Amino acid sequence: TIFEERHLKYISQLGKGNFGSVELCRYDPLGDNTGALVAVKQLQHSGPDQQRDFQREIQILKALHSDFIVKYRGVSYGPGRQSLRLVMEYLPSGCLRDFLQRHRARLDASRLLLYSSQICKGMEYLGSRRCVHRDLAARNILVESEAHVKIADFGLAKLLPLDKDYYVVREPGQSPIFWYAPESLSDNIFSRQSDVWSFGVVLYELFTYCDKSCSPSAEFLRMMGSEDVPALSRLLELLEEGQRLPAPPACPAEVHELMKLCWAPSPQDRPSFSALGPQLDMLWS
Amino acid sequence: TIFEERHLKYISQLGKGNFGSVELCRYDPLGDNTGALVAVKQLQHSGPDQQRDFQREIQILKALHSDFIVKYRGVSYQSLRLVMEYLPSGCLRDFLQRHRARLDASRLLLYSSQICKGMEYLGSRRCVHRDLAARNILVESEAHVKIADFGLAKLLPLDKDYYVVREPGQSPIFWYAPESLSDNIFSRQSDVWSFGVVLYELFTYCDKSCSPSAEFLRMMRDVPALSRLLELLEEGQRLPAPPACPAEVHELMKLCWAPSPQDRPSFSALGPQLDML
Ligand SMILES: NC(=O)c1cnc2[nH]ccc2c1N[C@@H]1[C@@H]2C[C@@H]3C[C@H]1C[C@@](O)(C3)C2
Numbered sequence: 178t179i180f181e182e183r184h185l186k187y188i189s190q191l192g193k194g195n196f197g198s199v200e201l202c203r204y205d206p207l208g209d210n211t212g213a214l215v216a217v218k219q220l221q222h223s224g225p226d227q228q229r230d231f232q233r234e235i236q237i238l239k240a241l242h243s244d245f246i247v248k249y250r251g252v253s254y255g256p257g258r259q260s261l262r263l264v265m266e267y268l269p270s271g272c273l274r275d276f277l278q279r280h281r282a283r284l285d286a287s288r289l290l291l292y293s294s295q296i297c298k299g300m301e302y303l304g305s306r307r308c309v310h311r312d313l314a315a316r317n318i319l320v321e322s323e324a325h326v327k328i329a330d331f332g333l334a335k336l337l338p339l340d341k342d343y344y345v346v347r348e349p350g351q352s353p354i355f356w357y358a359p360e361s362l363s364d365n366i367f368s369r370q371s372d373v374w375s376f377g378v379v380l381y382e383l384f385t386y387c388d389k390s391c392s393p394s395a396e397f398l399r400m401m402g403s404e405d406v407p408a409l410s411r412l413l414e415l416l417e418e419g420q421r422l423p424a425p426p427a428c429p430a431e432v433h434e435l436m437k438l439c440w441a442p443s444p445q446d447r448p449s450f451s452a453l454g455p456q457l458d459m460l461w462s
Numbered sequence: 463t464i465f466e467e468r469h470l471k472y473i474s475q476l477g478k479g480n481f482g483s484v485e486l487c488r489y490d491p492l493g494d495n496t497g498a499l500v501a502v503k504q505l506q507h508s509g510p511d512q513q514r515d516f517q518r519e520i521q522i523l524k525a526l527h528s529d530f531i532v533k534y535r536g537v538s539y540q541s542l543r544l545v546m547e548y549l550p551s552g553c554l555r556d557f558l559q560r561h562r563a564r565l566d567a568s569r570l571l572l573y574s575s576q577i578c579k580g581m582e583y584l585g586s587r588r589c590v591h592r593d594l595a596a597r598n599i600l601v602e603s604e605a606h607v608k609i610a611d612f613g614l615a616k617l618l619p620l621d622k623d624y625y626v627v628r629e630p631g632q633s634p635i636f637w638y639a640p641e642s643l644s645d646n647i648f649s650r651q652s653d654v655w656s657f658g659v660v661l662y663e664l665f666t667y668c669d670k671s672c673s674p675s676a677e678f679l680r681m682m683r684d685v686p687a688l689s690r691l692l693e694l695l696e697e698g699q700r701l702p703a704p705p706a707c708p709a710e711v712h713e714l715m716k717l718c719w720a721p722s723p724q725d726r727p728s729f730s731a732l733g734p735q736l737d738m739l
């Protein structure tokens with residue numbers, strides 16, 4: 178629950194954000210090296226807005242209990258009893274985006290549909306906590322084992338007003354625009370329905386095995402093209418025309434049709450993660 | 463943007479102080495009574511200290527933008543008046559007492575959620591309210607409340623996280639924190655203590671007989687009225703769990719009332735802990 182700074186042995190780095198970083202550590206009080214591996218998030222060179230949002234993240238994660246969401250283990254009040262480090266579980270198999278590219282050969286559609294379903298269940302639970310993840314993408318999905326994946330990176334995650342179902346972000350997005358829904362791009366509006374849009378994209382990522390040559394980045398930039406209008410503005414224009422990501426190579430038709438529903442123009446017309454769950458689970462049987 | 467005195471029709475009094483008063487008016491330049499209502503504040507027989515502070519007050523509130531903080535509207539000028547929006551349902555304390563049958567526990571969480579968010583934003587503007595209490599919260603609609611009364615609200619120095627009031631406040635002792643009561647230290651963490659008391663008010667539906675004052679008074683021979691409370695807060699005594707209060711909210715009030723300000727939760731941490739119940 179409470180992690181002594183001196184017993185967190187640093188090993189190496191897992192990610193370096195713009196205002197923060199995630200370090201792989203071993204919490205080893207006993208010295209014999211049997212202590213558990215943990216991911217530890219902390220801030221660097223950050224202003225007041227980030228420190229405050231970082232404190233929201235810790236509470237949101239502390240409060241999420243699901244097999245399909247990465248585990249909060251504790252916090253550490255750090256060197257000089259001043260700073261703040263967020264301690265989480267370490268999953269050694271790594272992120273899904275990298276895992277699919279490496280082990281592509283030993284993984285068939287069934288296994289891909291298992292992942293999708295676990296993620297969908299995870300996202301259904303986040304809905305139930307009135308929580309919008311806001312950064313759902315293969316790079317933030319972790320692999321617990323070859324048959325278990327988890328959702329991670331709650332940095333952009335936000336709870337809804339208790340009386341409303343949507344939320345507006347005052348400062349616009351910085352994370353890749355290719356997972357963002359149109360109302361998010363045009364108006365910085367976010368919701369469970371917006372997360373449903375992004376889940377369409379992770380299905381695409383999944384069934385393209387995160388192959389870089391047909392990534393959302395890769396595909397949209399080929400459709401947007403270069404012409405000066407900003408890249409955010411022309412993607413939106415592309416999306417309002419009704420243009421979407423194309424059917425992946427060898428994609429099961431009925432999976433591509435579920436994406437299309439995730440990507441409906443109006444948020445009210447996208448299926449809930451509750452509607453999607455069974456639809457994924459009993460696609461073939 | 464700026465209001466004319468001759469177009470401000472006086473209606474009735476909203477509040478009064480030892481050196482200040484607030485008035486309800488319709489700003490009615492067309493003269494046909496279709497103007498908007500406004501709460502208008504000004505000073506009366508005050509000293510230079512009050513006039514100075516009142517300008518600070520105008521300028522802070524002028525620059526606050528939150529759906530949970532009463533909206534500065536403008537000013538009217540020889541002697542200055544602060545014009546604000548008028549919320550017609552009045553303050554929360556009187557509302558909770560009047561409409562308790564109509565309001566369930568879930569909606570008290572919503573008012574809590576919204577006050578915390580207002581206090582979070584005041585925190586980010588490096589600003590301390592000093593008089594957080596239900597008597598200073600306003601009802602915009604049945605599902606929306608707003609913080610008001612920035613009379614005693616002070617901005618923290620740019621390079622420090624606390625403020626010291628050399629001339630202490632005559633306003634009620636029961637909302638104050640132990641460092642306030644003892645050494646006049648005010649801070650964002652002080653505002654957290656008082657939020658704890660605001661929670662108590664909410665979940666007791668601002669019932670008179672079990673007010674913070676009434677309850678703290680019941681928990682106390684004769685010495686000074688102040689130095690009995692501080693001696694009692696430093697023992698460990700706190701306000702009771704209200705009857706119409708969930709367990710986990712009472713735990714948030716006790717955390718809010720930790721002895722050391724450093725141990726008390728931020729409004730940033732509190733928020734989710736309220737919203738996720
Ligand atoms: N609990 C964890 O966060 C975590 C657990 N096991 C891991 N194994 C490899 C990375 C990694 C973790 N964090 C990484 C960090 C945050 C997020 C997710 C990972 C990849 C990313 O790019 C984006 C940087």
Ligand SMILES: NC(=O)c1cnc2[nH]ccc2c1N[C@@H]1[C@@H]2C[C@@H]3C[C@H]1C[C@@](O)(C3)C2
Nearest residue numbers: 476477484501546547548549552598610611
């Ligand atoms: N702009 C306003 O402040 C305001 C707006 N709408 C209102 N409707 C009823 C009172 C009232 C207002 N002021 C009151 C005044 C200051 C403060 C808040 C209110 C109650 C109090 O006791 C403490 C006296």
